[PDB]
Amino acid sequence: SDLGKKLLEAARAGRDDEVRILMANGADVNAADVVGWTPLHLAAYWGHLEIVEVLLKNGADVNAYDTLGSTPLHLAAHFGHLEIVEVLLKNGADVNAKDDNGITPLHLAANRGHLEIVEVLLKYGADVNAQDKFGKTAFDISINNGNEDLAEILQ
Amino acid sequence: MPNFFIDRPIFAWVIAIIIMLAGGLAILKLPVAQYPTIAPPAVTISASYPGADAKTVQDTVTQVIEQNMNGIDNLMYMSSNSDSTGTVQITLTFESGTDADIAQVQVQNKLQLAMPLLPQEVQQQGVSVEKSSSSFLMVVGVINTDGTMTQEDISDYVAANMKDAISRTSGVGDVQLFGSQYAMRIWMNPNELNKFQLTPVDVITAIKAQNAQVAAGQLGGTPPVKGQQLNASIIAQTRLTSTEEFGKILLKVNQDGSRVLLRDVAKIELGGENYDIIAEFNGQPASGLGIKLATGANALDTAAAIRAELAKMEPFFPSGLKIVYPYDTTPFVKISIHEVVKTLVEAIILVFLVMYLFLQNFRATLIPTIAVPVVLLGTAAVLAAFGFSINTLTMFGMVLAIGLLVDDAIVVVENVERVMAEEGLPPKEATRKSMGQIQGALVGIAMVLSAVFVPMAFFGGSTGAIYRQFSITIVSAMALSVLVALILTPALCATMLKPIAKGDHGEGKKGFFGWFNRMFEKSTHHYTDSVGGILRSTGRYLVLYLIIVVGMAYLFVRLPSSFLPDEDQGVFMTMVQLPAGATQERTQKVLNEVTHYYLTKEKNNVESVFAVNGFGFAGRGQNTGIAFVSLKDWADRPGEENKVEAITMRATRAFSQIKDAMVFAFNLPAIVELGTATGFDFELIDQAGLGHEKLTQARNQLLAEAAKHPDMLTSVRPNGLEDTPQFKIDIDQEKAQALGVSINDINTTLGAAWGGSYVNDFIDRGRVKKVYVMSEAKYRMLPDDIGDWYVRAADGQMVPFSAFSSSRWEYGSPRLERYNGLPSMEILGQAAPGKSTGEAMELMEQLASKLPTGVGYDWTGMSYQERLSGNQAPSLYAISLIVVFLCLAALYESWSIPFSVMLVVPLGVIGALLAATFRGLTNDVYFQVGLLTTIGLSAKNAILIVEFAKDLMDKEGKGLIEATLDAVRMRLRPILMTSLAFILGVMPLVISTGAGSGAQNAVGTGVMGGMVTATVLAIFFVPVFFVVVRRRFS
Amino acid sequence: TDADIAQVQVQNKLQLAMPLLPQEVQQQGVSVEKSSSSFLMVVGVINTDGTMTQEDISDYVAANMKDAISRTSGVGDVQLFGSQYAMRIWMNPNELNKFQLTPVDVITAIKAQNAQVAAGQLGGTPPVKGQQLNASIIAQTRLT
Amino acid sequence: PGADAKTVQDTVTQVIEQNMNGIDNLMYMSSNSDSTGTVQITLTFESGTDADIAQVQVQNKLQLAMPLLPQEVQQQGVSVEKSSSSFLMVVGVINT
Amino acid sequence: GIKLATGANALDTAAAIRAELAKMEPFFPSGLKIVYPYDTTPFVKISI
Amino acid sequence: EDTPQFKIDIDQEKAQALGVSINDINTTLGAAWGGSYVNDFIDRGRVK
Amino acid sequence: ERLSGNQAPSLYAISLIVVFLCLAALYESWSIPFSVMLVVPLGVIGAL
Amino acid sequence: LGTATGFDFELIDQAGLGHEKLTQARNQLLAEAAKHPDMLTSVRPNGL
Ligand SMILES: CCCCCCCCCCCCCCCCCCCC(=O)O[C@H](COC(=O)CCCCCCCCCCCCCC)COP(=O)(O)OCCN
Ligand SMILES: CC(=O)O[C@H]1C[C@@]2(C)[C@@H](C[C@@H](O)[C@H]3[C@@]4(C)CC[C@@H](O)[C@@H](C)[C@@H]4CC[C@@]32C)/C1=C(\CCC=C(C)C)C(=O)O
Ligand SMILES: CCCCCCCCCCCCO[C@@H]1O[C@H](CO)[C@@H](O[C@H]2O[C@H](CO)[C@@H](O)[C@H](O)[C@H]2O)[C@H](O)[C@H]1O
Ligand SMILES: CCCCCCCCCCCCO[C@@H]1O[C@H](CO)[C@@H](O[C@H]2O[C@H](CO)[C@@H](O)[C@H](O)[C@H]2O)[C@H](O)[C@H]1O
Ligand SMILES: CCCCCCCCCC[N+](C)(C)[O-]
Ligand SMILES: CCCCCCCCCC
């Protein structure tokens, strides 16, 4: 739609004022781009905490996935946006969500080595024994990355 | 010296002839162009990495080259782009005065030593080191009308049969093909390759083996066996020539016996090198040639030669192929020359009319008709010697000089005619006295006018180069005019003019000329009686002077300033920008709608629309395009409503309706390298390896801050492209080693298929051309197609790409900028209405200082030159003043009297500002030089009035008021004759509506309006200025 | 003698030799310079706080200073009193032998896994009719 | 190396020659391609032309052609020098 | 160790180096400082 | 004047059947009949 | 060779005009120059 | 221009003798140069 495109750009940029207006005007919160990213995906990726909260309040799909099956929790967990990861999980984000590769937010958070997020994901009941298409756990990544602190948390 | 040539009229005639011959010779040989070289020397390093993304190109090519641009002479700054098309451009801009050849070879040499550090594929494609030049002489479009040929089919014919001949044409400096010559395209089928257990690696291996030049040797080569009879060259395998031969390339032989060939696993055709651009001319497929003008060549002759060459190529053209001329500057340059020669002739015709109106004899009217052409020709000889070319700036530079050239002729003759009338002296002795009265002033005037115009040339940067063209042109013209006035015209006046009886002012004649003499003689008495009353109450005119000075200063500040006025060139641009991530097809639909509008609703105005899909000045990609609109003849489009600006603004309003596209039209600037006055060019640098995202945020922080000052800064925007979605595909190393698949085979299969791979050369009809292996369209479109590509493992089994790969979406730059070997982000913008650039820049510097730690800034392009060369303006103005004062001080032998002359400046300027502000023109170069010629002539008039008045007080021991009234009486007629002639002479330029009118309007209006005040005011005011000054200091 | 032309004539001849030189000598980059043998000035760089080592200071000077000074007009040559950082792989022969490996395998592996690949584009030109997706493909990149 | 005149002319001579358009003070350009594989494109310039500047202008224009040439030709090398056709002297050497 | 290019002006080149170093100082890490332990231009400037 | 040329034609399909690489063929012909520049050596303190 | 011959007429033409104008200026006359310059053919025939 | 009255001599291997023989030739020259303090002073090689 007309406003759908302006929300995607506004959600990406981080313009809180423009989002508020578009939420009032009635912009589609499930409006995807070409790759299949909702405004929540954009806000989750670029780390805009308020817009993530604003979109979720406006009945935005928290478990919306792209053409490759990656959710906003994947993008938030991978790029180390601790604050956003918590908000998504509270609004009912699937912590064991698998993309087309079988990669969960735990795998991504482990690979970039975001210690604080790994604990939060585990706290909300993340499957630590979860494997990707190559049969790799979050622990398998930590020992291959050589992250001693991360490996100890996964024990 | 006048006395020397009054007794020696033949010596003067010899000098006249020598000058005329030298000038005549110069006009024949002088180069002809639209505009000369103005922008500083720049060297553009360009390369291509087929299939490579922005980052890949940057971190493999751009950074490596940038690091090895060390020990080069007179380098100012170095900018670079690295885009997702696989292209890189590094523009090294040099100091104004640097040898562009030395600058190029120094860059080209330091690159050669960095070539071994670049990737194999980039070394293979090559790196081009060229001198920057956007100024095309003309673009020759080549189109197919019967739809038998594609754009690639046309491009090949142009490359083979036309380009080489157009290159060898007399006066052509460089030629640029719009499109590529044929390439052997192998469109691979992944389902077929997997069926026979093959890969792109095998296809590349097979092509390199079976399409190659093999060395053999000779029969009976030295050292031979003594008694050898025959010595012949052994010819082995050579390069393939046809698609059929590439089809019969053997890949594999099966056990059963049946053979696997390249045609069995791929489609083969003679295609283009790349498919990024889709060129169209009113819907029909199109290519073309970008022709540039050689150094010191003639644009008119070069154009005629190109057309004459294209003409004799037409008989060999295939059925459907036609030549079109969407862009051509020589039509404009033809009119520029004709209109100037028409003005210079009409000027001398009007002098004849004015000379005869007042003096009333044909022996007087000839002397200016002789003297002026002698100077005009002489000027060409001096400019030819200085190495100048016939261009718009030097042409109009002489039109502006007409005022000074016409005066020097009139002043000398009138003064002789006056002395003969008042004293009844014979022509020869009357000329000796006449020249005796003015010779001192004319030598003074030369040094004064020199002091005005010479400093104008000493300006730096692009703007300073334009001023230099007007400066040397006017100084040269004026210099010879004074020289001719002291050599030729005295001799002519002494010989040609007949005697006049003492007291005979032609009041005793009949008819029109009888009435005019009594009319003027009593008008002269009204004028002297008038000045008489003015010189009793001088106080109120010093008040009226301050009203003019405040009037001037007011209008000066509240007149919009520019570099050059926009012209109707017969063409204009129309940008088409779609949302980022859009496809080539989407952009074509918009360009089709844009092309439709112009050929439908603007059918009366528009001739053709060159729809270039894929091209964008501020970044390439599928989601950008340009429509090059070509209009019909200037005569066929009557009224302002059917001119470019009117069509431009109508089109912009129409295309604002278009759904998902930023579409708008804009007229082309006179010179592209300047940009816009009020506009600035700001570079935001990464000074501590912060990365891309951290510089993106810092840019967004500055753009947000700049937006919160609309009163100072407007249209503040990034020049670059925004981050776009990209398909990240991690190759699992363990899974690849486990199945026995090498990383070379994986990265080659992906790179060759999806990106393309330049394998080697082949010879199509005796021309070396490229061979590209790539995936057929339908197997390299969507992420699902990744899994359909199979790589062979060491064990022999075929492994799909899915088995050892994982993919996800991320955001990355499709065009990474750098400035002085550091990551940069160019930000454009302009000063708000009323504000100067200096104010706008000073705020941008303040906002920049409150950005995160590690983020620096710098000024580039027009802003870099404005920061440095702009500061010279007052220091030259100062030097000019001191020299002018010194020159007048020497002339009059008085520190005080010079002031009387220097007070005349505003009288000429006020009129120019009225005419400009009234009409709605700008403070442009044509107007600004237009002032200096109006100031120069008003000063010249005053210098004579003050000299005459002074000489009467010194020699004949007259009173101040007596001498002043006597002086202004004698100088009344020649001032009116010069003005009447010049104002009528420049009148056509003011009312001009047709081609190149914008410049004529700027030149004409700023002179006519200024001359009206300069004449009307100075005749009353210079008397006042002299009296007040002479009283104050004596 | 025109030093600018002297450089051009000398390099013209060096370009004929460059191919005949080893692959290793070319990849270190041959330089043709026209400078006075004696030093104009020495620009010393130190850390007063003692936060950075001799090797750290040298790296910064090479990475964030040297290039711009070398590009400056009149600067014939710039000698770095130090060395720019480089990813050092300090090999252990006892450990290479244990896993049946050599320096060759280490060099081969680095060349394969530390590589910046040209992987093309999705919906790249020439595309199919009715394509809506266009995005650059990113395979392996350089290691940081 | 190991190329015939026909092949050399198509792949090298014509490629270089068609990049030698628009050079300051060029009178004429003679060239030859032989069966040994050699090319020799001699550009004669106007009388009084700065020979060193001429050389630079040619070198610059050649390096646009350089990458379009075959791989073998680039590895062998290409020179751009000021050339006279006749010998000042021949200095013979014999063994008595 | 900066060496003067063939036929270039020592003082003018030295001035340009200081202008380039002056643009780098603001973006230095905490503690880093420029020192001038050798320079031939100060003599040429003062001696004249 | 135009000279005669000895045009030898290598059958790559027939070579593959016998199990010989066309690289070895090209090198064997090229080296033998034309001569091949392998590398350099030192003849009395000079590279040749 | 052809260049030398093609410019020879232009060379004689201007050379005559210059010598004529040079004499015209020096002796302040048109008769003296024209009276002298009629001698040129008497010399040229001797050379031929 | 160099030091007041210093000289820069080059000893050349004109007939491709080798390094060792050029070293011995140099040692012979330095030996004979050493035993003329009245004429020559501090004569030494610049190399290692
Ligand atoms: C490749 C090149 C292309 C071709 C270009 C061609 C260039 C041609 C240049 C040569 C032009 C020469 C023209 C000569 C004109 C002579 C006219 C009079 C001749 C004559 O003998 O009469 C004299 C009196 O004439 C008088 O009345 C003398 C008074 C002053 C006369 C001035 C007016 C003449 C105008 C000449 C210029 C016109 C041509 C412009 C190009 C007597 O002689 P005398 O010795 O008794 O004189 C006394 C002085 N003491
Ligand atoms: C410093 C500077 O910009 O000098 C310029 C500008 C200039 C100083 C002018 C000389 C003189 O009128 C000046 C006076 C005091 C003249 C009287 C008033 O009208 C003043 C409002 C005016 C201010 C500027 C002006 C107009 C200059 C000259 C001298 C040129 C003189 C002649 C005869 C053409 C110059 O440019 O050389
Ligand atoms: C820098 C000097 C300052 C300006 C001095 C005065 C400028 C005005 C005079 C310019 C006239 C001389 O310029 C001369 O114009 C004539 C026009 O017939 C041109 O003559 C040309 O006409 C047409 C134009 O397309 C061609 O097809 C043809 O081949 C040729 O005869 C010359 O190629 C040009 O050199
Ligand atoms: C339309 C605006 C553009 C025009 C710009 C030119 C302005 C000058 C206009 C012409 C002025 C001449 O007009 C002249 O004015 C002066 C006043 O100063 C008059 O002078 C008269 O009044 C003054 C003041 O009371 C007396 O000292 C004087 O004795 C008396 O003759 C003249 O009688 C008249 O002839
Ligand atoms: C340096 C400025 C030149 C000003 C011109 C001076 C000319 C004065 C002539 C005086 N005169 C000799 C005619 O009596
Ligand atoms: C095409 C004309 C070029 C002119 C070169 C310089 C002329 C000098 C004349 C003395």
Numbering used by the authors:
A (entry chain D): 12 to 166
B (entry chain B): 1 to 1034
C (entry chain A): 98 to 241
D (entry chain C): 50 to 145
E (entry chain A): 290 to 337
F (entry chain C): 722 to 769
G (entry chain C): 866 to 913
H (entry chain A): 674 to 721
Question: What does the article say, verbatim?
Answer:
CH4 transport-compromised AcrB-Phe380Ala shows binding of FUA at the lower end of the TM7/TM8 groove proximal to the cytoplasmic side, surrounded by TM5 and TM7-TM10. This implies that FUA may enter via CH1, but also via CH419 and is in line with the observed substitution phenotypes. Since β-lactams and FUA have been shown to be transported via CH4 as well, we realized that the c-loop may play an important role in drug transport not only via CH1 but also via CH4. We therefore compromised the entrances to both CH1 and CH4 (Phe380Ala_Phe563Ala), and observed indeed a strong sensitivity towards FUA, β-lactams, and the failure to grow on DDM by cells harbouring this variant, whereas wild-type activity is retained towards doxorubicin and rhodamine 6 G (R6G), presumably transported by the unaffected CH318. In sum, the results suggest that CH1, with its TM7/TM8 entrance groove, is the main transport pathway for LMW/LPSA drugs, DDM, as well as FUA and novobiocin, starting with binding at the TM7/TM8 groove and peristaltic movement of the drugs to the DBP. β-Lactams, DDM and FUA are transported independently via both CH1 and CH419,25.
